[PDB]
Design a protein around this ligand. Structure first.
Ligand SMILES: CCCCCCCCCCCCCCCCC(=O)O
Ligand code: NA
Length: 276
């Protein structure tokens, strides 16, 4: 019966076997609005932004888009990108407020993922698994936050220009990636912000740094989700490394959506995993 809702930073549009709706964020220039929905041509957006010399912006969904996504269901879990970097969580809480004044039996839990992308996806899949196990809303609502403590996110970005111009990473940290061939490796912090771990020259050195970070994080071969921004080659190499080193069988590599493509930028990869 239950409904799962997430903002479009989760990169997915369906959850097979589940009732699920994604709620689009938007990316804008002074000339065009790109809505992160089924219609978006991300390759074309990235082409436009690469040669666009002006400022570009993102926006969280409107209260009305959330209400449309809630539909009329009486048990809803909403997963949002980190409240530490975005007004999305607050917009969902505002829409929940209106919804509960319109649906007297409704229960709505808004989950600040404290992260983005594949970590939102791992949360959504765990909600789906508990729902399929027949857990009740109250059991799931309590248990998901404990489950989240055993998940981590790491990223490797070739450019941090869009993060930096929107005030979401420091200039010193972004400047590293200005050098051709240098990526910045990050993790989601305990405050739901982007914590830079170090720089890295080339794919093979990334793989070795990621293996050390996963070891230290307590990774033991559990669920692993990797999204990429026009870098399937690198995501596949990471997935191969992890399967070899940890025995992982539950891996998915997939494309980033519009919002993550904008902030991770061409070449970027983001990964999330369950830890012990
Ligand atoms: C805490 C997560 C760290 C991982 C960062 C990897 C880059 C992806 C996208 C992050 C998006 C952060 C800002 C989103 C702003 C949306 C808005 O306009 O409110
Ligand atoms: Na770079």
């Amino acid at each position: 019966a239950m409904r799962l809702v997430a903002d479009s930073a989760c990169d997915i549009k369906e959850l097979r076997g589940m009732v699920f709706k994604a709620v689009p964020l938007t990316i804008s220039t002074d000339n065009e609005e790109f809505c992160d929905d089924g219609q978006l041509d991300i390759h074309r957006m990235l082409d436009i932004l690469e040669k666009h010399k002006g400022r570009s912006y993102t926006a969280c969904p409107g209260i009305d888009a959330w209400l449309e996504a809630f539909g009329d269901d009486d048990e809803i879990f909403v997963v949002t990108i980190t409240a530490g970097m975005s007004g999305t969580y607050n917009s969902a809480m505002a829409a929940r407020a209106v919804y509960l004044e319109e649906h007297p039996q409704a229960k709505v839990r808004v989950i600040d993922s404290k992260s983005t992308g594949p970590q939102m996806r791992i949360i959504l899949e765990q909600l789906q698994q508990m729902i399929e196990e027949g857990k009740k809303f109250e059991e799931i609502d309590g248990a998901i936050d404990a489950y989240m403590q055993k998940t981590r996110l790491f990223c490797s970005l070739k450019s941090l220009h869009n993060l930096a111009q929107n005030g979401r990473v420091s200039k010193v940290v972004a400047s590293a990636a200005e050098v051709l061939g240098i990526s910045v490796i990050g993790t989601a912090s305990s405050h739901g912000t982007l914590e830079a771990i170090g720089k890295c020259r080339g794919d093979k050195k990334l793989l070795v740094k990621l293996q050390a970070l996963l070891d230290d994080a307590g990774y033991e071969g559990g669920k692993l989700r990797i999204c990429h921004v026009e870098n399937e080659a690198l995501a596949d190499k990471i997935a191969d490394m992890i399967k070899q080193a940890y025995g992982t069988t539950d891996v998915c590599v997939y494309k980033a959506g519009g919002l993550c493509s904008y902030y991770a930028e061409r070449g970027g990869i983001i990964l999330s995993c369950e830890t012990k």
